[PDB]
Subunit: 61 residues, 6 copies
C-alpha cells in the first residue's frame, strides 16, 4: 500500500581497485568445468535460482 | 498501490579500476567448458534463472 | 496504481577503467566451449533465463 | 666511443586509461596562477630547466 | 668507451588505470599559485633543474 | 670502460590502479601556494635539483 525506496542498493559492487601482475597463467581442462578470475560482478534475481561462478561437472540421466 | 523508487541501484557495478600485467596466458580446453576473466559485469533477471560465469560440463540424457 | 521511478539503475555498469598488458595469449579449444575476457557487460531480462558468460559443454539426448 | 641503445625509454607515459565523471567544476583565479588537470604528459630536456605543471606567482624586480 | 643500454626505462609511467567520480570541485585562487590534479606525468632532465608540480608563491626582489 | 644496463628502471611508476570518489572538494588559496592531488608521477634529473610537489611560500630579497 506504500513503499518508498531511497538510495537503496542491492547486489551492487562499487569502488574497487585491483592490480594483478602474473608472469604466467595456464589452464588445462580435460572434460570438466573450470571458472577462473571473476572480479567485480553483481547480479540480482527475482523468482529464479542465481549463480555467479558455478562450475558444474558433467550431468547424466 | 504506491511505489516510489529513488536513486535505487540493483545489479550494478561502478567505479572500478583494474590493471592486469601478464607476460603469458594460455588456455587449453579439451571437450569441457572454460570461463576465464570476467570483470565488471552486472545483470538483473525477473522470473528467470540468472547465471554470470557458469561453466557447465557436458550434459547427457 | 502508481509507480514513480527516478534515477533508477538496473543491470548497469559505469565508470570503469581497465588496462591489460599481455605479451602473449593463446586459446586452444578442441570440441568443447570456451569464454574468455568479458568486461563491462550489462543485461536485464524480464520473464526469461539470463546468462552472461555461460560456456556449456556438449548437449546430448 | 660506443653507445648502443635498444628499446630505451626516457620521459615516457604509456598504457593509461582514465575516467573522470564530474558534475561541476569551477576555477576562479584573481591575479595569480592556476594549473589544473594535467594527465598523460611526458617531456625530456637536455641542457635546460624542465617544468611540467609549474604555477608561479607574480614576479617582481 | 662502451655503453650498452637495453630495455632501460627512466622517468617512466605505464600501466595506470584511474577513476575519479566527483560531484563538485572548486578552486578559488586569489593572488597566489595553485596546482591541482596531476596524474600520469613523466619527465627526464639532463643538466637542468626539474620540477613536476611546483606551485611557487610570489617572488620579489 | 664498460657499462651494460639491462631492464634497468629508474624513477619509474607502473601498475597503479586508483579510485577516488569525492562528493565535494574545494581549495581556497589566498596569496600562498597549494599543490593537491599528485598521482603516478615519475622524474629523473642529472646534475640538477629535482622537486616533484614543492609548494614554496613567497620569496623575498
Amino acid at each position: 500500500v506504500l513503499y518508498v525506496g531511497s538510495k537503496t542498493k542491492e547486489g551492487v559492487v562499487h569502488g574497487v581497485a585491483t592490480v594483478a601482475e602474473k608472469t604466467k597463467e595456464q589452464v588445462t581442462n580435460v572434460g570438466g568445468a573450470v571458472v577462473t578470475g571473476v572480479t567485480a560482478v553483481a547480479q540480482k534475481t527475482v523468482e529464479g535460482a542465481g549463480s555467479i561462478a558455478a562450475a558444474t561437472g558433467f550431468v547424466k540421466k
